[PDB]
Design a protein around this ligand. Structure first.
Ligand SMILES: OC[C@H]1O[C@H](O[C@H]2O[C@H](CO)[C@@H](O)[C@H](O)[C@H]2O)[C@H](O)[C@@H](O)[C@@H]1O
Ligand SMILES: [Cl-]
Ligand SMILES: [Cl-]
Ligand SMILES: [Cl-]
Ligand SMILES: [Cl-]
Ligand SMILES: [Cl-]
Ligand SMILES: [Pt+2]
Ligand SMILES: [Pt+2]
Ligand SMILES: [Pt+2]
Length: 407
């Protein structure tokens, strides 16, 4: 185990992990004298991050190649754990123009060097029960958050006559990274902002009036309009939300592109009855979608960097990317794939909602995001629980963010 072997560390939702196994099989079939060992990780992005930093900080060659959340990729680049890809691109005359340059420019490069490639580009999406909206006299998905609430309540009241577990709108509110993504969408769709850059350094503006107003709406979805379940802030993460909607217990769902792949699975009660649209916005502002996704990189400590690069090229290849979009519903890191007839047949929204993905709002791209996120999670979740007001929460978060930015 030191020649033509490579351990690929990857996680995700259960179905994605199973899909990766198939990808690895296809890779070894195309490259006969090579071995790729799967190092399975969890779904939770923080657990995936920890699994990786623990191996890397110990200069272990074990994980040779792996996926990194666009949210904390900057941390790995800054720490210097990634092997620059420039040399490998150069040697194979590899064409980089086939990837969305915006995400690359934003998160994959530093000091003129490339350290990773986008496997998929996630953006927040609104999933809705087309059949239920039609049933209750609504011809189109909601454009504003207030319209979503209106539809959600009428559908909820009607469905509860026979369904007491039905909720008009499910989303991620647990105290973890996913909550920051949901939060970002409400903030920017109300004209708010988490902060901006000054003199090359990010400066926090967590407690702007627009932000507080946005957080208040989130709190109201649970405690005032009551279209989102109480466990939204205690247990709801990607999968629990995705499962609840697929079970048929929700009219609306906010989730990432992967939910589509599952919702459209023949084992899905909602198959053929799900629509996808941009998330709503508050009047006078534009719809927002948080930028997410996973990028592939090579460990600086790998003893099989050449093989790792071969695997990277395969994962970023047209056919493999096409399979991700058609089977898993992922929005590819490689351009034009969304337009492939096979992809439009199974995941038409990748083409139709092109603007959603291209305009995804990035969380603060800074080496110390993990620590910043922890601050936002605590106060935002506390506010959702009703433990403190939106105002007190963002003001408190503002204080700690400033201290954190002070290095
Ligand atoms: O493909 C679904 C993936 O969802 C996670 O990733 C999204 O959600 C995170 C917050 O929970 C974001 O930070 C990330 O950028 C989004 O892509 C989940 O952590 C992954 O394991 C799933 O594969
Ligand atoms: Cl209450
Ligand atoms: Cl409640
Ligand atoms: Cl197929
Ligand atoms: Cl296909
Ligand atoms: Cl097909
Ligand atoms: Pt309540
Ligand atoms: Pt459920
Ligand atoms: Pt297909």
């Amino acid at each position: 185990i030191e020649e033509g072997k490579i351990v690929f560390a990857v996680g995700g939702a259960p179905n994605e992990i199973e899909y990766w196994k198939g990808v690895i099989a296809e890779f070894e079939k195309k490259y006969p004298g090579v071995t790729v060992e799967l190092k399975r990780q969890a779904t939770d992005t923080e657990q995936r991050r920890l699994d990786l930093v623990n191996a890397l900080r110990g200069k272990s060659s074990d994980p040779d190649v792996f996926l990194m959340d666009v949210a904390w990729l900057g941390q790995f680049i800054a720490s210097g754990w990634l092997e620059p890809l420039d040399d490998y691109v150069q040697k194979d005359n590899y064409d980089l123009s086939v990837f969305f340059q915006s995400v690359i420019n934003l998160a994959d490069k530093q000091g003129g060097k490339l350290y990773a490639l986008p496997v998929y580009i996630d953006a927040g999406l609104l999933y809705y029960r087309k059949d239920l909206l039609e049933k209750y006299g609504y011809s189109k998905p909601p454009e504003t958050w207030q319209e979503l609430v209106e539809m959600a309540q009428k559908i909820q009241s009607g469905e509860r006559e026979t369904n007491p577990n039905f909720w008009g709108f499910v989303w991620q509110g647990k105290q973890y990274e996913g909550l920051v993504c949901d939060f970002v969408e409400y903030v920017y769709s109300n004209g708010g902002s988490l902060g901006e850059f000054k003199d090359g350094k990010w400066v926090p503006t967590l407690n702007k009036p627009e932000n507080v107003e946005a957080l208040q709406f989130m709190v109201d979805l649970i405690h005032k309009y009551k279209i989102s379940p109480p466990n939204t802030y205690t247990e709801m993460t990607e999968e629990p939300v995705r499962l609840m909607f697929q079970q048929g217990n929700a009219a609306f769902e906010r989730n990432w592109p992967y939910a589509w792949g599952l919702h459209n699975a023949d084992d899905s009660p909602v198959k053929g009855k799900v629509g996808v649209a941009p998330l709503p916005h508050f009047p006078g502002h534009k719809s927002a979608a948080t930028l997410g996704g996973w990028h592939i990189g090579i460990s600086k400590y790998s003893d099989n960097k050449a093989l790792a690069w071969e695997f990277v090229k395969f994962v970023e290849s047209y056919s493999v990317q096409k399979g991700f979009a058609m089977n898993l519903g992922w929005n590819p890191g490689r351009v034009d794939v969304y337009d492939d007839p096979a992809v439009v047949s199974k995941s038409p929204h990748l083409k139709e909602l092109r603007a959603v993905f291209e305009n995804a709002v990035p969380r603060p791209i800074v080496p110390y995001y993990p620590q910043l996120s922890e601050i936002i999670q605590k106060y935002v979740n506390s506010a959702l629980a009703g433990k403190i007001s939106p105002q007190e929460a963002l003001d408190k978060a503002q204080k700690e963010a400033e201290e954190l930015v002070k290095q």
